[PDB]
Every structure is written in C-alpha cells, then in structure tokens.
C-alpha cells in the first residue's frame, strides 16, 4: 500500500479524521500504517525541553519548538505543560487538593455534556489498588474520591484485544471476533496476529466500538488507539490540546492508554521488585492528566475511567506442558499456545486426522496434569467461548501459573519471562481495576465487583448515547452512579400459563410405568385438594412465576413441596421452585419406591413422557428435577415419582445430580438458612448460548419425541442477611448458580472413579453461572415479584458465584 509521504502536517498534528492513502497521515496512528508525513516527527512529536515547566520558564517568549510551553499565552492556546500552574501560578497539584464532592458538574462555557476520558491500563491487576497504593497517589485518589470496585472481571481468554474490544463494544469475544491475540479465519482463510498488518482489515472487528456508537449519534470521538513510540506525556498533551478545541470542533469523549504495567510484568511477575517503578510512572502520568485537567477548569466536569484489561500471574518457562507428551501425531495438529490452547488439524487435507482420539490422549494422562482439554461446546458456560468458527473445536484449559506448548523447542527457539495472562476469567490473578470519578460517578462509594461487558452500557449513559446491542445487562450498573441512570421495565410475559386440574383417568395411560403406589381419610383429603391448587406455593415460589419470553404451550403445576412449569412441547418442566428450610430433613427413596414412576392425572397422555422409552434408551437413565430426598413426608414424597417431575439423564450425570440433590441442597440449606432452589433442563446444542427451538434438538431418548438437555441448572437464592430465613427475607439477596454439562462420562472429573464428596462440588464450582446465562439459554425472566428496585435485581442477576479465596 504505496503512501506520498512528501506531503505535510503542518496545522494537522493528531488530526482527528483520518484521511484515504495514497495521502500521509498525520493522526495519533499514522506510524502503525508507516503513513506518516515526512514532518510528523518534527511538528507533531516535539520533545525540547521536555515536559515540566521550572522557575526560569515561567513566562517565557513562546519557542514552537517546545515540547510544551509555560509562556502566559500557553492556557489560550491549550499547550502548557501539565505543572505549568503549579509551578508558574502559586497552584497545587490535583492529588493534593481534599476530596470535594462533585454534586453538580461544573463545566466550562459551551460545554454541552460532560466529557468522558478513558484511561485504560493493560495488565494492571486488580491487588495493586491495595499492594501499590503508597507509590500511586494520584490513582489512590481517584479510588477513594470516586467510585470505586475491589476488581473487575474480564473475559475469557483473559488477553489484551479480547478484553481491550469487549470494553468498548460490550460484547463477548466470541461476538465481537477478537478471540485471541492469534486467530485464524477459515472462511478468510486468514490469520490475525499482533505483528503485521492482518490486523487492521475492518473484517476480523464486529459489533460497534464506543467511538462509532457516538460518532452515529452526534457525538464526536478522539482517537482510541496510540501508536507505540508516542509517549504517554505527548498522549496526555494531546488529549488537552482537543479538549481546548472550539465547541463545534471537540470531542466528548477521549481514550489514553498505557502498555504499562504489562509490558514489566511479563518480564518480572506481577509482584517482583522490578514493578513499582512502572507503578509509579503510571500514577505521574494519571497526576499529569488531572493537573491538565485542573488548567482547564475541566477537573469537576469531565468523568473519568481507570481500568484495566485483565491481570497477571507467576509463568516461568519450566512450568511448561508439551503436547509431544501426550500425542503420538503432534506432526499433524497446529497449536495456538500459551496460557490457552486451541488445536485444528495442520492439513484440511488429512483425512487421518481426528479430533476424538485428541481429545483422550490429553484426557487425565498424568497424575498432576496443568490443562484439561475440552470440545467448545463443553466450555462452562460462563466462559461464554463457542460461537465463533475463529475458536478451534478443541480448547485446552490452562491452569493458572503454567502455559501449554507442542514440543519443547517451540520454548527455546522462540528462560526469559515471569508473569503471563490469559487463563479463565474467574482466577484472581487476571482479575482487573475500575475507578470511576467525576460529577456522573457516585462519591467516596465502592460496588460490588462486575463484569467488563456491562461497562459499554454505562459509557453509552455518561454520554447520553443509545447502546447497540450487546451482552450487558443495562440497568444492572445504575449503583455506580449519581445521575444518567437507564431505567428498564421487566420485559413482558409472552406465553400465559394453564392452570390444569384433575382431567384424565389413571388407564388412559400406557407410559409402560409402574409405581407400588396403591395404599389408601377426609382430614387429609381437603388438604391434598389444597396443596395441588397452591396453598403452599408462597413457601416454594419466593419471587414470583418465571416469565416465559417466547411463545409456547406450557403448564403451572402445584404441590406440597414443590412448583413447576411443565412444557408441553419438551414434555419435561422449564423450571421446578422449591424450598428447603435449615431444620427440613433428608430421607431415602424407600425400597418399594426405587422404580415408581407415577402419571399425572392433570396432564394429557399425549403430553406425558414415558417409561418404554427410557427402558429400550441403552445410553439413557432419568432422574428427577423436585429430589425425593427432599420430601416433607412419606405421602407427599409420591408427587416427586410423577412423570411430569421426570428428566432424561445419563448414568453418570445422575452419579453428579444424585450427589447435588441427596448432600448439597441440604448443606447450603444448613449454611444459608434456607435455601430457594430453581432447577430445569437447558437446550444449547448449536452452542450459542441461547435457548433451543425445537427444531435444534439433536438427540432425543430413543423411539420418542423426549428431547435430551445439553444442561441442568439450578439457581440458589437465600437471605443476604442470613439471620433471617430464605422464605422470610425482608432485604436483599444472595443467590449461586450452576449450569451443569449433561455428559454421558465424568471424563472431565479425573477424580470421578472416587465417592462424590471428592469431585462432584469442584465439577459444579467450575460451573458456576449468573442467572443472566441462564436466562438466555432457557427464555425464562426470574424474580419478577420481590420487594427489591429492579435495579437491584439486575445486579442480582449479574452476579457470579466465583469460589476464589
Ligand atoms: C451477545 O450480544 C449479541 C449482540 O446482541 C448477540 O448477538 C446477536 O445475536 C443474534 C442471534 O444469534 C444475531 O442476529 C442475527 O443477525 C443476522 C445478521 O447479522 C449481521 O448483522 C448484524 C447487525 O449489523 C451484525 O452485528 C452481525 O455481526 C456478526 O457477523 C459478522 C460477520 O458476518 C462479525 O464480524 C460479527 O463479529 C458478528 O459475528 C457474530 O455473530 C454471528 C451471527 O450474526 C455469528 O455467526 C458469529 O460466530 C459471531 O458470534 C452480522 O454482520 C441475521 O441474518 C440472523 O437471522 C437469521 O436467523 C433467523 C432465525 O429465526 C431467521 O428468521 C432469519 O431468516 C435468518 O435465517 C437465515 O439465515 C440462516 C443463517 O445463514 C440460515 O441458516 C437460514 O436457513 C436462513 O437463510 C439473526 O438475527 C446478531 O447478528 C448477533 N450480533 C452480534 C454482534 O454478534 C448475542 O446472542 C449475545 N450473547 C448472549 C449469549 O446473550
Ligand atoms: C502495538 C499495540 N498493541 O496494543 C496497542 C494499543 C492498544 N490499545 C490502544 N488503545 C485502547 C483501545 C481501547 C479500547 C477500549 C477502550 Cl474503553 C479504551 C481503549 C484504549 N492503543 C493501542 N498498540
Ligand atoms: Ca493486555
Ligand atoms: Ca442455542
Ligand atoms: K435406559
Ligand atoms: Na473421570
Ligand atoms: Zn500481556
């Protein structure tokens, strides 16, 4: 791509236009395209006498040929040094001033908003808020002024595109594209690296970056990204000299950002000595901006952001696995390596290859083995990591502190390096920062830690901006702020609920079931009439039905100890609700009882599962969405053998569900003081992360129209306040949930061959979910009646249960 470099950017220095080549550039990232005028380093890049004004400075006759001025026309013209007040005027730097609350903005004449600033820092871990804070003032400051939360989670793979793309689209990576610092496009056939010039084809960047959802709204941007070589004091200088452009002509919102403290981290670990002089440059620079800021009367005005993209953890070259240890053909796979794997055949002329003899030659090989492969689709969920043709069928799970490689010389012909990044979003070590400061933020307050694609959203409102769509649940960030919050209804219900009673007669059923259920009193014959239409159901339904978002035939079904909503097209419930207090006690499933499956009078035949099926199924077993376990009392205990409480499962997901059902639900009872439990089935087979139509089912139990869940969840609410009991909670609440893979093997648990109570709670930490995730696969609204702000309850469902020390 030829460039005429012999033109000039005289008065055009980081314009904010980029222009068409053949003509050279002259913005904050002509020197990645080797576009630049041939006067770009001369007019644009000044460095004399560097960036502080001194005493003898001090009104100056303005030299052009300054890095910055101190020269009395130097506020008029926006190009005074960032100390030039303090040092010049009597005035005091920014971190020294107190905390004063910014009830109001306070704004220059003729600006129309606030302005946004971004200050991105990649690396930046989420313990160096407490572990830096003697060395970082000014950041210190703005945490404790502002609003401010423990850490911020980033996405999966914990990497600096993925993550720097999600910040400014709200998407997941497998949405936006950016799924790796590496990718490889099939239908391109085209390979996107940090070297080279792949990267910047417009094709490898969907969804809509903060700068293009302004810029179609009115609302105009600086610049996001900054060519490497400009320094972070010509960065901040620039960012002012826009800021003191004309009404018309200034953007409303600005990103700095600094390869620090990443670049020292991978060569020194996250904590080694080496890093507190990164620390502090950092914090000088943030200093810089606000004494900026502060010149122009812009210190109680503009919003900013401090955040990172992910963290950093201890790598060293030693703690390194290599393929070549497992595979005989390590020859036939291409590898993306590092902190993640993802494997495709290195030939699509291979007719050898194949991925399930991969996947168990990497499968619980050696004892203390660093990875664990997985196929996408058996990703946990909450990595939300498939729906893209750029991630590889087969993904290799890296534990924290190791990386993955093909073969030992691919470490040696490529030890050097300390720290690295990129393992699953939930480890402490990737965890990141968010500070937010300025009239819009809340004063002095800390939040609870979230998601990074739920910042978007809230750019979108500090800049009065309509979101494209994306995965942040907007709404559910209203507590950070003062003012500008987005105010959401709860979506409508689509599908209304029947409301069956007694309708069929026992022999019309030919299920092929059987129950030992023939035992026979007007005492306890009102009160089994009453329990089946509902007079338990304010113990089991704590926050309301379930909203269904889509339409279909479904059923409301009452009893004592439990509440569903039995889907008459997937002929299993959507949801089963059900209580279980501190004192309730666990029992068997009687002897005589092992096998009953019972049919419910309420429900046609037609819409009825059978037992025929499951009996011919060879692979397929059942289990139950209400636990017999949990039965209030023997009679009541038969409503949980009825076949609309009946649910496909394989033998050995109910060694799991059997375990969660018989000991867990009874320990968070005991831990909780109750616990509210909702449980269902989740069909994902084109692994999207949104709920199935029928015609997406690709396995039913054998012979019938029974279709097999790709998942069971269950969402765990309690008291937050756990003096009081779930089902007599006045204030906010605690919730965990679980999606749990439905696996025909427990190859994922190398420990499975021993008792549950050794591997079947590690399997459900591991998937571990937000009630948001489960609301996309299932269609399904929770919490629609609570005594809680809606907002609240956005949060709420937001929340992830992470099970990190
Ligand atoms: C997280 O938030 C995001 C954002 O909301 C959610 O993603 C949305 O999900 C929708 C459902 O999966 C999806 O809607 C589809 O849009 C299709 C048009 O898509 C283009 O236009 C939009 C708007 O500008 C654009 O954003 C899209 O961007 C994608 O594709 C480009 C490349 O083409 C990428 O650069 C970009 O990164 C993005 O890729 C991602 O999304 C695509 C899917 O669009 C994936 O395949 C990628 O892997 C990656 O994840 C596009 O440029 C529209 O055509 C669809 O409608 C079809 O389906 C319905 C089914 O009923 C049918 O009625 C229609 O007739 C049509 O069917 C016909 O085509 C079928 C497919 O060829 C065919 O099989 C049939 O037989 C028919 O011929 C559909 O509405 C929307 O695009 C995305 N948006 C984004 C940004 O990803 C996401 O779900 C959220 N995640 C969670 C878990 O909640
Ligand atoms: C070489 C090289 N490798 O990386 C970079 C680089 C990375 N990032 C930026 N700017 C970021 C992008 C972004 C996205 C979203 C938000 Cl909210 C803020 C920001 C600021 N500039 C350059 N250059
Ligand atoms: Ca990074
Ligand atoms: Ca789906
Ligand atoms: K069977
Ligand atoms: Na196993
Ligand atoms: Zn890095």
Redesign the pocket.
Known sequence: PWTATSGSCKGRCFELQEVGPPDCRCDNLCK?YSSCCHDFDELCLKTARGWECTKDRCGEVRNEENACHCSEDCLSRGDCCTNYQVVCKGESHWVDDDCEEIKVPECPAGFVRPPLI?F?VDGFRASYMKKGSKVMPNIEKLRSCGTHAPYMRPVYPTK?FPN??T??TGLYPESHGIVGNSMYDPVFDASFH?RGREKFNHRWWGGQ??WITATKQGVRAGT?????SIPHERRILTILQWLSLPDNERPSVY???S?QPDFSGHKYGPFGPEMTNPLREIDKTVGQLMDGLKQLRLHRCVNVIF?GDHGMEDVTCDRTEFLSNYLTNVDDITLVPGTLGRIRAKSINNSKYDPKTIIAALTCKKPDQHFKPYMKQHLPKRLHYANNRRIEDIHLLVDRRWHVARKPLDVYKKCFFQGDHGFDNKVNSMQTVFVGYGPTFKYRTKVPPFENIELYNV?CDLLGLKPAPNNGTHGSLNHLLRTNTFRPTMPDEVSRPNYPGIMYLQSEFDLGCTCDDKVENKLEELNKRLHTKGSTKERHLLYGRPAVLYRTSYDILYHTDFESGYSEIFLMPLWTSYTISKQAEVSSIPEHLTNCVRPDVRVSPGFSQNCLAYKNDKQMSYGFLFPPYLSSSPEAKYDAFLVTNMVPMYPAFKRVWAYFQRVLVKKYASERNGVNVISGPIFDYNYDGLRDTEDEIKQYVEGSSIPVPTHYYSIITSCLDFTQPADKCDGPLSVSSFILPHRPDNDESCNSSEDESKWVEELMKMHTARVRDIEHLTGLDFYRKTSRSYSEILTLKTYLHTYES
Request: proline content about 5%.
């Open positions: 990645s971004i991105s600096t720097l793309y910040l400014a940090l970056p903060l996001f990204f900054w060519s490497v990103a700095f950002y390869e955040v750019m």
